[PDB]
């Protein structure tokens, strides 16, 4: 002998929420801008020699 | 009788006691069941422990 059991309407399960995400594009390395170092080196010599 | 018979096949000593009293079925707290009523009258169903 067993106890009776009637199955009711199922309870609401917790809802799953999807997500579409697009990534951030990485930074770009700065190209090599360059100073004319030798010019100012000769400069301080000429003004000094005067 | 069947419990004592089965105990011997397992190699266990049969149920035995000394002194004035009697043998009966009890719940986990030691409370004995009613001697004159059906197991269907009491709250007993398949899989209970006694």
Swiss-Prot record, chain A:
The chain crosses the membrane at residues 38-50. Disruption phenotype: Mutants are defective in the secretion of EsxN, PPE41 and PE_PGRS proteins. It is found in: Cell inner membrane. Part of the eccB5-eccC5 operon, which is essential for in vitro growth. Part of the ESX-5 specialized secretion system, which is responsible for the secretion of EsxN and a number of PE_PGRS and PPE proteins, including PPE41. Part of the ESX-5 / type VII secretion system (T7SS), which is composed of cytosolic and membrane components. The ESX-5 membrane complex is composed of EccB5, EccC5, EccD5 and EccE5. This is ESX-5 secretion system protein EccC5. It comes from Mycobacterium tuberculosis (strain ATCC 25618 / H37Rv). The gene is eccC5. The chain holds residues 1 to 50 of 1391 of the full protein.
Curated annotation (Swiss-Prot), chain B:
Disulfide bonds: none annotated. Disruption phenotype: Mutants are defective in the secretion of EsxN, PPE41 and PE_PGRS proteins. Mutant is highly sensitive to detergents and hydrophilic antibiotics such as ampicillin, vancomycin and bacitracin. Virulence is attenuated both in macrophages and in the severe combined immune-deficient mouse infection model. It is found in: Cell inner membrane. It comes from the Bacteria. Part of the ESX-5 / type VII secretion system (T7SS), which is composed of cytosolic and membrane components. The ESX-5 membrane complex is composed of EccB5, EccC5, EccD5 and EccE5. Was identified as a high-confidence drug target. Belongs to the EccD/Snm4 family. Part of the ESX-5 specialized secretion system, which is responsible for the secretion of EsxN and a number of PE_PGRS and PPE proteins, including PPE41. This is ESX-5 secretion system protein EccD5. The chain holds residues 52 to 101 of 503 of the full protein.
């Amino acid at each position: 002998m067993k106890r009776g059991f009637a199955r009711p309407t199922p309870e609401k399960p917790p809802v799953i929420k999807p997500e579409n995400i697009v990534l951030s594009t990485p930074l770009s390395i700065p190209p090599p801008e360059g100073k004319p170092w030798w010019l100012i080196v000769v400069g301080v010599v000429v003004v000094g020699l005067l | 009788k069947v419990v004592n018979s089965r105990l011997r096949e397992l190699g266990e000593a049969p149920l035995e006691a000394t002194g004035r009293g009697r043998w009966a079925l009890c719940l986990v707290d030691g409370a004995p069941l009613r001697a004159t009523q059906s197991l269907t009258e009491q709250d007993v169903y398949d899989g209970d422990r006694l």
